Design an enzyme around this catalytic site. Structure first.
Site, PDB file in Angstrom:
ATOM      1  N   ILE A 189     -60.976 -60.856  10.288  1.00 44.59           N
ATOM      2  CA  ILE A 189     -61.047 -62.288  10.802  1.00 44.59           C
ATOM      3  C   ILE A 189     -60.439 -63.093   9.846  1.00 44.59           C
ATOM      4  O   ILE A 189     -60.512 -64.268  10.161  1.00 44.59           O
ATOM      5  CB  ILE A 189     -62.567 -62.757  11.299  1.00 44.59           C
ATOM      6  CG1 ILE A 189     -63.547 -62.581   9.845  1.00 44.59           C
ATOM      7  CG2 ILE A 189     -62.776 -61.737  12.363  1.00 44.59           C
ATOM      8  CD1 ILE A 189     -64.834 -62.769  10.371  1.00 44.59           C
ATOM      9  N   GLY A 190     -60.218 -62.880   8.790  1.00 39.31           N
ATOM     10  CA  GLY A 190     -59.694 -63.622   7.690  1.00 39.31           C
ATOM     11  C   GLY A 190     -58.599 -62.997   6.310  1.00 39.31           C
ATOM     12  O   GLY A 190     -59.244 -61.806   6.158  1.00 39.31           O
ATOM     13  N   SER A 191     -57.527 -63.465   5.905  1.00 38.75           N
ATOM     14  CA  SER A 191     -56.927 -62.958   4.978  1.00 38.75           C
ATOM     15  C   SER A 191     -56.453 -63.817   3.948  1.00 38.75           C
ATOM     16  O   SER A 191     -56.505 -65.236   4.346  1.00 38.75           O
ATOM     17  CB  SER A 191     -55.358 -62.436   5.781  1.00 38.75           C
ATOM     18  OG  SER A 191     -55.708 -61.976   6.848  1.00 38.75           O
TER      19      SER A 191
ATOM     20  N   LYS B 252     -66.898 -60.907   3.538  1.00 34.67           N
ATOM     21  CA  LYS B 252     -65.904 -61.419   2.612  1.00 34.67           C
ATOM     22  C   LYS B 252     -65.412 -60.368   1.357  1.00 34.67           C
ATOM     23  O   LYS B 252     -66.499 -60.510   0.607  1.00 34.67           O
ATOM     24  CB  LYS B 252     -65.776 -62.808   2.267  1.00 34.67           C
ATOM     25  CG  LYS B 252     -64.659 -63.197   1.510  1.00 34.67           C
ATOM     26  CD  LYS B 252     -64.333 -64.597   1.430  1.00 34.67           C
ATOM     27  CE  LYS B 252     -63.377 -65.135   0.729  1.00 34.67           C
ATOM     28  NZ  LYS B 252     -62.973 -66.539   0.766  1.00 34.67           N
TER      29      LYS B 252
ATOM     30  N   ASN C 173     -66.534 -69.163 -11.733  1.00 35.60           N
ATOM     31  CA  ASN C 173     -66.454 -69.899 -10.225  1.00 35.60           C
ATOM     32  C   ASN C 173     -66.514 -68.930  -9.064  1.00 35.60           C
ATOM     33  O   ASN C 173     -67.383 -69.474  -8.079  1.00 35.60           O
ATOM     34  CB  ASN C 173     -64.736 -70.044 -10.242  1.00 35.60           C
ATOM     35  CG  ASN C 173     -64.517 -71.304  -9.231  1.00 35.60           C
ATOM     36  OD1 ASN C 173     -65.363 -71.420  -8.215  1.00 35.60           O
ATOM     37  ND2 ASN C 173     -63.390 -71.939  -9.393  1.00 35.60           N
TER      38      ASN C 173
ATOM     39  N   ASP D  33     -64.622 -78.880  -0.729  1.00 35.17           N
ATOM     40  CA  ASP D  33     -63.652 -78.437   0.121  1.00 35.17           C
ATOM     41  C   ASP D  33     -63.925 -78.712   1.763  1.00 35.17           C
ATOM     42  O   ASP D  33     -63.799 -77.687   2.379  1.00 35.17           O
ATOM     43  CB  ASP D  33     -63.326 -77.097  -0.069  1.00 35.17           C
ATOM     44  CG  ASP D  33     -61.968 -76.636   0.274  1.00 35.17           C
ATOM     45  OD1 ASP D  33     -61.193 -77.649   0.268  1.00 35.17           O
ATOM     46  OD2 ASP D  33     -61.797 -75.438   0.435  1.00 35.17           O
TER      47      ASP D  33
ATOM     48  N   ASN E  71     -63.166 -74.723   7.032  1.00 38.79           N
ATOM     49  CA  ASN E  71     -64.262 -74.417   6.503  1.00 38.79           C
ATOM     50  C   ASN E  71     -65.704 -74.793   7.249  1.00 38.79           C
ATOM     51  O   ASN E  71     -66.557 -74.883   6.814  1.00 38.79           O
ATOM     52  CB  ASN E  71     -64.636 -74.732   5.175  1.00 38.79           C
ATOM     53  CG  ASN E  71     -63.413 -74.452   4.199  1.00 38.79           C
ATOM     54  OD1 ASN E  71     -63.035 -73.167   4.431  1.00 38.79           O
ATOM     55  ND2 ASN E  71     -63.161 -75.130   3.259  1.00 38.79           N
TER      56      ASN E  71
ATOM     57  N   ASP F  84     -67.905 -71.447   3.485  1.00 39.00           N
ATOM     58  CA  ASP F  84     -66.847 -71.379   2.285  1.00 39.00           C
ATOM     59  C   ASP F  84     -67.265 -72.299   1.172  1.00 39.00           C
ATOM     60  O   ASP F  84     -66.908 -73.371   1.021  1.00 39.00           O
ATOM     61  CB  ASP F  84     -65.265 -71.701   2.594  1.00 39.00           C
ATOM     62  CG  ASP F  84     -64.566 -71.144   1.740  1.00 39.00           C
ATOM     63  OD1 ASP F  84     -64.960 -71.055   0.454  1.00 39.00           O
ATOM     64  OD2 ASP F  84     -63.381 -70.788   1.750  1.00 39.00           O
TER      65      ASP F  84
ATOM     66  N   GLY G 194     -66.750 -71.777  -1.944  1.00 34.96           N
ATOM     67  CA  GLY G 194     -66.088 -71.508  -3.058  1.00 34.96           C
ATOM     68  C   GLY G 194     -65.703 -72.889  -4.193  1.00 34.96           C
ATOM     69  O   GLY G 194     -65.244 -72.553  -4.987  1.00 34.96           O
TER      70      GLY G 194
HETATM   71  C1  LIG Z   1     -61.983 -66.485   8.046  1.00 38.70           C
HETATM   72  N1  LIG Z   1     -63.347 -66.320   8.763  1.00 38.70           N
HETATM   73  C2  LIG Z   1     -63.661 -66.419  10.032  1.00 38.70           C
HETATM   74  C3  LIG Z   1     -64.884 -66.516  10.180  1.00 38.70           C
HETATM   75  C4  LIG Z   1     -65.773 -66.316  11.550  1.00 38.70           C
HETATM   76  C5  LIG Z   1     -65.388 -67.680  12.369  1.00 38.70           C
HETATM   77  O1  LIG Z   1     -65.735 -66.879  13.478  1.00 38.70           O
HETATM   78  C6  LIG Z   1     -65.515 -66.587   9.172  1.00 38.70           C
HETATM   79  C7  LIG Z   1     -67.023 -66.778   8.562  1.00 38.70           C
HETATM   80  C8  LIG Z   1     -67.331 -67.050   7.201  1.00 38.70           C
HETATM   81  C9  LIG Z   1     -66.099 -66.840   6.316  1.00 38.70           C
HETATM   82  C10 LIG Z   1     -66.456 -66.899   4.846  1.00 38.70           C
HETATM   83  C11 LIG Z   1     -65.947 -67.788   4.007  1.00 38.70           C
HETATM   84  C12 LIG Z   1     -66.152 -68.019   2.676  1.00 38.70           C
HETATM   85  C13 LIG Z   1     -66.796 -66.998   2.160  1.00 38.70           C
HETATM   86  C14 LIG Z   1     -67.385 -65.982   2.697  1.00 38.70           C
HETATM   87  C15 LIG Z   1     -67.077 -66.132   4.208  1.00 38.70           C
HETATM   88 CL1  LIG Z   1     -67.954 -64.268   4.846  1.00 38.70          CL
HETATM   89  C16 LIG Z   1     -64.656 -66.548   6.387  1.00 38.70           C
HETATM   90  C17 LIG Z   1     -64.519 -66.552   7.971  1.00 38.70           C
HETATM   91  C18 LIG Z   1     -68.674 -67.040   7.355  1.00 38.70           C
HETATM   92  O2  LIG Z   1     -69.394 -67.062   6.303  1.00 38.70           O
HETATM   93  N2  LIG Z   1     -69.205 -66.827   8.515  1.00 38.70           N
HETATM   94  C19 LIG Z   1     -68.112 -66.977   9.479  1.00 38.70           C
HETATM   95  O3  LIG Z   1     -68.272 -66.776  10.578  1.00 38.70           O
END
Ligand SMILES: Cn1cc(CCO)c2c3c(c(-c4ccccc4Cl)cc21)C(=O)NC3=O
Ligand SMILES: [Cl-]
Length: 257
Positions: free
Chosen positions: A13-15, A34, A48, A130, A135, A147, A149
């Site tokens: 779901i994320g890159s 993640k 960080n 951020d 986010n 997020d 971070g």
């Molecule tokens: C790219 N991406 C897409 C999603 C889901 C939206 O349906 C997503 C999530 C997270 C995160 C996320 C962001 C930052 C750190 C850790 C995580 Cl798991 C990133 C996400 C998160 O913590 N919870 C998410 O749903």
């Protein structure tokens, strides 16, 4: 590995490294997980990396902050709450293309929800740094800050600046006297994005003009009360912007509360 044996990967779901939608095999439940390259031990990048984890772990009681379950470690992993509705950025791209944006009653509800999240974060003597639509996550819809971070302590002498589309001029000028109001300024620009605006500029003359306190064009009629509350939130003087507590108690938002 614990990742492999504990979870079934469903989908990417994320890159960036990667975030996967996974089902933990024991509890049957879906989580967003993640995976990043583990930084060198004792480096500034590791510090960080560890603040995000420390932030997640004091910021786990809130309705409008993405919940954290676990983190562990040549990779670091964080297992968070999976939000079924996607990011606000994707909702805002789908809207863009269909010419139907968030209406005023929904912009108020977004503003108020995220504002309660920031109030919670700020009362922890922390700042997010951020705030932007990619986010904010969606799961009555719920908006949740995610997020963590760039999260820092509020009186921190050094700061990692967030996305430049959403960055307050005083933060760029290295002035951290009023860090909470940087989150306030980014929330307003987030709300303007949601209202239907063109993609925000990252530098150049249009960037500066917003930092003078002028709202970007919004392709829909909002009440003057509401527009005025968004403008005060991007005021050049961070002290003139509402605190998150003032925001959530604002009369303009009472009809959303
Ligand atoms: C790219 N991406 C897409 C999603 C889901 C939206 O349906 C997503 C999530 C997270 C995160 C996320 C962001 C930052 C750190 C850790 C995580 Cl798991 C990133 C996400 C998160 O913590 N919870 C998410 O749903
Ligand atoms: Cl975004």
């Amino acid at each position: 590995s614990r990742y492999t044996t504990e979870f079934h990967e469903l989908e990417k779901i994320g890159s960036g490294g990667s975030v996967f939608k996974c089902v933990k095999r024991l509890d049957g439940c879906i989580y967003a997980i993640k995976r990043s390259k583990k930084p060198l031990a004792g480096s500034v990048d590791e510090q960080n990396a560890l603040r995000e984890v420390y932030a997640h772990a004091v910021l786990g009681q809130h309705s409008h902050v993405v919940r954290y379950f676990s983190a562990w470690a040549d990779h670091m992993l964080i297992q968070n709450e999976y939000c079924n509705g996607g990011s606000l950025a994707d909702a805002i791209s789908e809207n863009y293309r269909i010419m139907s944006y968030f209406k005023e009653a929904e912009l108020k509800d977004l503003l108020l929800q995220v504002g309660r999240g920031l109030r919670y974060i700020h009362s922890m003597s922390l700042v997010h740094m951020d705030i932007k639509p990619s986010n904010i996550f969606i799961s009555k819809v719920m908006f949740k800050i995610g997020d963590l971070g760039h999260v820092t302590r509020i009186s921190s002498p050094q700061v990692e600046e967030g996305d430049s589309r959403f960055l307050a001029n005083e933060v760029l000028q290295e002035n951290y006297t009023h860090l909470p109001k940087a989150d306030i300024f980014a929330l307003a620009l987030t709300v303007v994005c949601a209202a239907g605006a063109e993609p925000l500029p990252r530098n150049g003359d249009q960037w500066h003009e917003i930092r003078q306190g002028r709202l970007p064009r919004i392709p829909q009629v909002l009440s003057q009360e509401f527009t005025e509350l968004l403008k005060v939130m991007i005021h050049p003087d961070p002290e003139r912007r509402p605190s998150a507590m003032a925001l959530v108690k604002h009369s303009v938002l009472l009809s959303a509360s």
